[PDB]
Amino acid sequence: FSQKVTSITKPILVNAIHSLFSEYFHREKVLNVADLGCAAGPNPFSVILTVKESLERKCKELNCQPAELQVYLNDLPGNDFNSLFKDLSGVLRTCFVMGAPGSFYGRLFPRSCLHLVHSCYSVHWLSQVPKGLTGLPLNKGKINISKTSPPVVEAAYLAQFKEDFTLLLKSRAEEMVQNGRMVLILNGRQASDPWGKESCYHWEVLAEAISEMVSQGLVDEEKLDSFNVPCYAPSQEEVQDIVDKVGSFAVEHIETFTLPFANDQESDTRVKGEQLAKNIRSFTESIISYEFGKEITEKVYHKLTQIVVKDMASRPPTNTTVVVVLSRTM
Amino acid sequence: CFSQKVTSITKPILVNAIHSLFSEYFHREKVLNVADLGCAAGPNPFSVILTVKESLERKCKELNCQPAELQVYLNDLPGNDFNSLFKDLSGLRTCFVMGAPGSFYGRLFPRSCLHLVHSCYSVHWLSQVPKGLTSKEGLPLNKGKINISKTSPPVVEAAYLAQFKEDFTLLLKSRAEEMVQNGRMVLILNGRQASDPWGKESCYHWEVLAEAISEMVSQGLVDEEKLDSFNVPCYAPSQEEVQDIVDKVGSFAVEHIETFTLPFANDQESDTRVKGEQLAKNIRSFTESIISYEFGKEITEKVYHKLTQIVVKDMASRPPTNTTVVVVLSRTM
Ligand SMILES: Nc1ncnc2c1ncn2[C@@H]1O[C@H](CSCC[C@H](N)C(=O)O)[C@@H](O)[C@H]1O
Ligand SMILES: Nc1ncnc2c1ncn2[C@@H]1O[C@H](CSCC[C@H](N)C(=O)O)[C@@H](O)[C@H]1O
Ligand SMILES: Cn1c(=O)c2c(ncn2C)n(C)c1=O
Ligand SMILES: Cn1c(=O)c2c(ncn2C)n(C)c1=O
């Protein structure tokens, strides 16, 4: 899945880079790139290579020396920059890679210096759990928007997102050169899709595993009730509406695509389920662990592995991605 | 006290260099860019950030202008503990702090963007152990020691100086390409008074480590050939050497040159034992990794135990000094 996403989207990144060339940004002394929420895995390496290779390839054609490249790798201060920097030791030459700790909800970089901003699977995370999920907890059974969720949950999540995403765009707007491009890829939904397993498979199946622990009386039902993940899956329409209100970007590309969550290149339904569960753990573990402690979380994932395995044998789940490319105007 | 003494004595030099930036109206540019070479993870980088931030804010008040934004690059080798550094920096408004992993012997930053470069106790470390500390035959010159000593043949001295000339030149050439016209660079490093002999006067730590090693050779727990052909990639230059190297690189003017010598141990401690133990701990903390890599964990732990006994003994008779060289450059042409 992670592989599928990066490979499907690579041409979009490359097209955005090509836009930079018809502005002669490759003729400037340095090209500045930012990756928002880079984590520590291989995706940042691949973003660096894509830009580096495309920049080198084009300067070969035009018989000029390539601009130098500066890549800022942004993530929250708790990110494992140590590992990231150790792995980057095995691009160089004319290539200067920085760590930029901080939240992308706010200023991170000098005014109008960025030529390219990139983000893959970060900007769906909210700055806080949305307000108005309370006293008394609305959204009783669940940890995200669901089939069973009252209309107010939906509206609260959307409102939080509108705030956050607007603050993201405003910050990036201040930091980008005229005609700079920004490529944003995030977990999303098809508008005509219902809530529940269609769009938020992972949040639904986690709430199931929690509910099994409540049922075993190992967790208070009030805890599940007033637990909510600070994460939203927008439609492309929502994204585009938010962008429309911030008058400093032109939309150059908008896209939604839906894949199977489970890995195709595996024939056995077992393993397929276990892998998907492992995958889900790997990006939900820290938020779950922090809320329920190590002992209970270990139990939650064991039941999760049983739920997904069962799901593989009947209706296999999907996952949906929204992609937008913006150009800085005015 | 020592690390504290160095940062506090040199703070005015940093501030003067910053003030030079103001008379170039760099505070009127959109961003002021600062680099700290070899920042490690301790409190010194925080203090450099504060010094610049405070001075920049203070002077924009005075001249009634819009404050430039501040960008600070914190450079160190990859596998420096940037995790801890970044966590501590969280306890930062129009103030953008970056990690810049890599060696300062080489390019690290875009061409001509830096206004201020700062470095405290880094650039004395060489890029490699210097070549030519072994004869044609294959015999190791510099028999007893791990740095330049009283007992060292002339070729050791000349090889270390040559390595430093290479390294320091490469540092200056790289920074020259990366600094704006009239940018300042403040370099503070462990050094020597020219008229000082080699040995305990200038390289206390290398001398006392070679002692501890020699005690392990004496207990036959380490081959004498290992000590013989082991050499630390570190030099303590005179201010004259530094100035000669700078003179050959035609892109900097010297604005300040300084040598000063302090007691190594913390003076505000009355007990000789603790004074010695502290100095030893201090010495371990900056020599551990290169000692450990060479002799393994088991014998290194023994080396530091004997080191702690040697320094404690030294505190009670002749207390050691340590010497610092400081230079400030301006980017010209
Ligand atoms: N406000 C914020 N500012 C910066 N990083 C953030 C953030 N909120 C979440 N993140 C980071 O976003 C990342 C999401 S995981 C995706 C990582 C990478 N883009 C990839 O494709 O693999 C995490 O590392 C998380 O710490
Ligand atoms: N070539 C090189 N490039 C970058 N950092 C280097 C380096 N050689 C040594 N260093 C770093 O220089 C540091 C010296 S310790 C000094 C820490 C800090 N400047 C202070 O005043 O406390 C070490 O962390 C070491 O890893
Ligand atoms: C890192 N990450 C997420 O953060 C994520 C996700 N699906 C939804 N989200 C929120 N996937 C597949 C993922 O790899
Ligand atoms: C890192 N470091 C050194 O590298 C050093 C030193 N004194 C001498 N040297 C070489 N001190 C105090 C120090 O902290």
Residue numbers in the entry:
A (entry chain B): 26 to 115, 124 to 167, 171 to 366
B (entry chain A): 25 to 115, 125 to 366
Reproduce, without paraphrasing, sentences from the article in which this PDB structure was first reported.
Our phylogenetic analysis showed that although the YM genome does not appear to encode XMT-type caffeine-producing enzymes like Coffea and Citrus, it does contain three recently and tandemly duplicated genes that encode CS-type enzymes, IpCS1, IpCS2, and IpCS3. A second enzyme, IpCS2, shows activity only with 3X to produce TB, while a third enzyme, IpCS3, exhibits a preference to methylate TB to form CF. Thus, collectively, these three enzymes appear capable of catalysing a complete pathway from xanthine to caffeine.
In order to gain insight into the structural basis for the convergent enzyme activities, we obtained a crystal structure for the terminal enzyme in the pathway that forms caffeine. As is typical for the SABATH family of methyltransferases, IpCS3 exhibits a Rossman-like fold composed of seven β-strands surrounded by five α-helices which bind the methyl-donor S-adenosyl-L-methionine (SAM), as well as an α-helical cap which binds the methyl-acceptor theobromine. Although the IpCS3 structure was obtained in complex with its product, caffeine, it can be assumed that the binding mode is conserved for its precursor, theobromine. Indeed, our computational modelling of theobromine in the active site of IpCS3 predicts it to be oriented as we have discerned from the diffraction data. In CcDXMT, the NE2 of His160 and NE1 of Trp161 form hydrogen bonds to carbonyl O2 of TB when positioned for N1 methylation; yet, in the structure of IpCS3 these corresponding side chain groups form hydrogen bonds to O6 of TB. Despite these two residues being conserved for H-bonding, the substrates are rotated 180° along an axis going through N1 and C4. Thus, the conserved His and Trp residues interact with opposing carbonyls in TB/CF but still position the substrate for N1 methylation. Tyr368 of CcDXMT is found to participate in π–π interactions with the ring structure of TB Lanzarotti et al., 2020; yet in IpCS3, Asn353 is found in the homologous position and the amine forms a hydrogen bond with N9 due to its proximity within 3.2 Å, which is additionally stabilized by Asn221 and His236. Because the residues in these positions of IpCS3 and CcDXMT differ yet contribute to TB binding, these independent replacements represent convergent structural solutions for N1 methylation of the substrate.
